[PDB]
């Protein structure tokens, strides 16, 4: 009994953390910097803790509307260069992880390791990127988790939507915190005023 209140049960359930959409007719690619802060319901559960550490399993559910479409999904790890164009050199780099997926095949899945240079992710961070009045404060300073990039490989009028399902695995969590009592206004910020 009480395994359903284990941290693996509470934080380790798959959820749609991002919603990549793009069109084709540059243009035919999209990118998303990976964070758990986008969706309030996911964010609130992770923010019950000060630090968390997990590997993460990505599953990408794709729907498309105008032969079968071919997509490249690319994971760019922290501090590596992110694509600027649909056929940039970054898509060919053997240091990025790519999965090529073709329509009607089972949805693509991969696990990213815990990538951070610190031993856990900071859900909160009481410090700065530097000394300046312009310097960032809070959990945006730490926690580059990488970027998910999508392009169509096929030659040509179509709309593509990719739901990024994420499951945290082998989860550890430290220093419990009061639950968020008021609405989230912005990503990584503790600000609450409407």
């Amino acid at each position: 009994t009480r395994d359903e209140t284990s941290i693996e049960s509470f934080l380790g359930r798959s959820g749609c953390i991002a919603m990549i959409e793009f069109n084709t007719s540059g243009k035919g690619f999209k990118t998303w910097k990976v964070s758990l802060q986008e969706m309030a319901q996911i964010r609130r559960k992770y923010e019950l803790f000060t630090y968390t550490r997990f590997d993460s399993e990505i599953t990408i559910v794709t729907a498309a509307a105008a032969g079968h479409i071919v997509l490249q999904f690319m994971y760019v790890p922290p501090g590596a260069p992110v694509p600027e164009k649909r056929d940039d050199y970054t898509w060919q780099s053997g240091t990025n992880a790519s999965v090529f997926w073709q329509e009607g095949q089972p949805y693509p899945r991969f696990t990213i390791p815990f990538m951070s240079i610190a031993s856990a992710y900071y859900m909160f961070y009481d410090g700065y990127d530097g000394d300046s009045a312009a310097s960032k404060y809070g959990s945006v300073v730490t926690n580059d988790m990488g970027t998910i990039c999508v392009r169509i490989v096929t030659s040509n009028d179509s709309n593509i939507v990719c739901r990024i399902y994420h499951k945290a695995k082998h989860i550890k969590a430290w220093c419990p915190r009061p639950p968020r009592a008021v609405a989230y206004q912005h990503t990584h910020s503790t600000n609450y005023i409407p």
Binding site: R53, P106, I112, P179
Partner: protein, 224 residues
């Protein structure tokens, strides 16, 4: 020679298969010791947190929601406070245990309620703290509360009192959306010498006992 079976190629969002590492050869940063690891949410439920008993429109934007007034200038026949014991509803819903239970459909086990008197060392008073079981109906008077399960608490002698409400329902769990009432009554007037405040505040707290359990997780708009 294999047959795929009707589940084959599904993305079931609750599945637990292995999957390929995107980055073999990469070794993650070593896990150092960090104080205060949490392994189960029931560790957090066991912490005493303040009940916002004083829910009135003047107090709910402030620290004053947590403090119950005790005073000389009062109708001593009226209830001091009452708390419904269901963690599903006000005032318990925004406590840490009410918040953690809101992520689950079902709860069970014992609740510890604690009361702390914050008057001067020269202030003395008796309060009657009564528990009324579910379905019995909230006491209308100090005499009716005294005929039930109760503590006569002398706040002069003891600055803190506690009550453990054990699990009492037909099923081993109940839904997170009665458990009875805790009610407080004046047993005496508020007694002080000269040059002492003729009023004080009391703080109410709640936590889980070691038997507490939550079941069937759910996500819902109880936070926007």
């Amino acid at each position: 020679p294999v047959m795929l079976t009707p589940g084959s190629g599904q993305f079931l969002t609750t599945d637990d298969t292995q999957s390929p590492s995107a980055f073999p050869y990469f070794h993650p940063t070593k896990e150092i010791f960090i104080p205060g690891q949490v392994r189960n949410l029931i560790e957090m439920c066991q912490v005493d947190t303040l009940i916002p008993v004083n829910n009135t429109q003047e107090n709910v934007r402030s620290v004053n929601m947590y403090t119950v007034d005790l005073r000389t200038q009062v109708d001593l026949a009226k209830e001091v406070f009452s708390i419904p014991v269901d963690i599903a509803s006000q005032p318990l819903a925004t406590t840490l245990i009410g918040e953690l239970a809101s992520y689950y459909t079902h709860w069970t086990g014992s609740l510890r309620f604690s009361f702390m008197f914050c008057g001067s060392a020269s202030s003395t008073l008796k309060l009657l703290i009564a528990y009324t079981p579910p379905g019995v109906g909230k006491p209308k008077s100090r005499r009716e509360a005294m005929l039930g399960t109760h503590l006569v608490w002398d706040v002069g002698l003891q600055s803190t009192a506690s009550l453990v409400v054990p699990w009492v329902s037909a099923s081993h769990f109940r839904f997170t959306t009665s458990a009875g009432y805790i009610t407080c009554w004046y047993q005496t007037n508020f007694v002080v010498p000269d040059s002492t405040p003729d009023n004080a505040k009391m703080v109410c707290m709640v936590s889980a006992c070691k038997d507490f359990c939550l079941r069937l997780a759910r996500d819902t708009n109880l936070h926007t």
